[PDB]
Enzyme design. Structure first.
Site: not given
Ligand SMILES: [K+]
Ligand SMILES: [K+]
Ligand code: NA
Ligand code: NA
Lengths: 159, 162
Positions: B14, B17, B20-21
Site C-alpha cells: 500500500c 504500510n 491496508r497492507s
Molecule cells: K512490513
C-alpha cells in the site's frame, strides 16, 4: 503575451496511445483559440518500451480522421526534471498518478492531476489504455472533452 | 496440498504500510493457517512511501485485528524496493496508484505478477481499497480486505495446485 509560456505535459504508460492523442488534440484546440504563442504541449510515458517510436496506429488513425497533425511526435520517457519544467502534468489514469507521485518523492505534486479531473460530472476518472482495450474511439471521446475542459481551466486561471 | 517444495511468497503493498497492507498481511496469514498452508505460503507487506518506516500498524488497523483476534506481533512498516519485485511470487497492491508506483520502480524488471487485491474478487468493483489514513473508514477496509484475501488465497491454491 504577458509573462512566460505555459507548458502542459500529458502522461500515459507507453506514450504511444493516449498521451500523444491528448498532446495533438490539445495543441490543435489551442491553435484554434490563437494561443499557440502562449501555451505549449508535450507528452511522455512512464514506461520505456516504445521510446523513439511514432504514436500507435490506432491513434494515428483517429488523429487523421480529426484532421489533426502529429508530425515529428515520437515517444519519450518522463524524467524527474519534467516535474520541474512543466506547469501542468496531466495524467491519463490513476496508475500514471501513482508513478508520477512516487517519481516526485511525494513532494511538490499539486500540479499533477488526471485529465478527467477537469471534466465536471464525468462518470469516469480514468482514460482507459487502448493498448489493452482496443478501444480507441472511447479514448478519443474522453480525451476530446478532457482537453476542451482543461484548456478552458488554464485559460481562466492564467489570463 | 503442498511443505512440499519451495515456499510461495506474497507481498502486500500500500502507500504507507501502516493501514491496508499490514491488515492484509495479517488477515491473509490467518486464512492460510486455517487451510493448513503455513508451511507453503509466506506473506509480508511494504509501502510505496517512507514516512512511517519502522512503525507498527495504524491504531485503526490494530483495533480491527484485535477484534478479529488476529496477531500482528513484530509487524513494522518498511518501504518497498526493487529487490522485492524479484523476491516475491505475488505482489498484491491495494489500489491503482500503488500499481503505478511499482511500475515506476520496476525499470526493465518483469511486472506481470503485480495485481490489485480486488482484481481477485471477480467481480465486485470497487477495484481499489480506499486508504483509511485519509478516509477514516477502517470498517469498510476490513470488509474489502477480508473478501479480497479469501479470493486471493483460493486463486493461489488453484494456480499452484495447493
Ligand atoms: K512490513
Ligand atoms: K512524446
Ligand atoms: Na512545475
Ligand atoms: Na518474482
Amino acid at each position: 503575451g504577458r509573462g512566460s509560456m505555459i507548458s502542459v505535459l500529458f502522461v500515459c504508460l507507453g506514450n504511444i496511445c493516449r498521451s500523444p492523442m491528448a498532446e495533438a488534440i490539445f495543441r490543435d484546440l489551442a491553435a484554434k483559440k490563437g494561443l499557440e504563442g502562449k501555451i505549449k504541449a508535450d507528452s511522455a510515458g512512464i514506461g520505456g518500451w516504445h521510446i523513439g517510436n511514432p504514436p500507435h496506429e490506432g491513434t494515428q488513425e483517429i488523429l487523421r480522421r480529426e484532421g489533426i497533425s502529429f508530425d515529428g511526435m515520437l515517444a519519450r520517457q518522463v524524467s524527474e526534471q519534467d516535474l520541474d519544467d512543466f506547469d501542468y502534468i496531466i495524467a491519463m489514469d490513476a496508475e500514471n498518478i501513482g508513478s508520477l507521485r512516487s517519481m516526485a518523492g511525494f513532494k511538490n505534486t499539486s500540479h499533477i492531476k488526471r485529465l478527467l479531473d477537469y471534466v465536471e460530472d464525468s462518470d469516469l476518472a480514468d482514460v482507459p489504455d487502448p493498448y489493452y482495450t482496443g478501444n480507441f474511439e472511447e479514448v478519443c471521446q474522453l480525451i476530446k472533452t478532457g482537453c476542451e475542459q482543461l484548456l478552458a481551466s488554464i485559460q481562466k486561471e492564467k489570463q
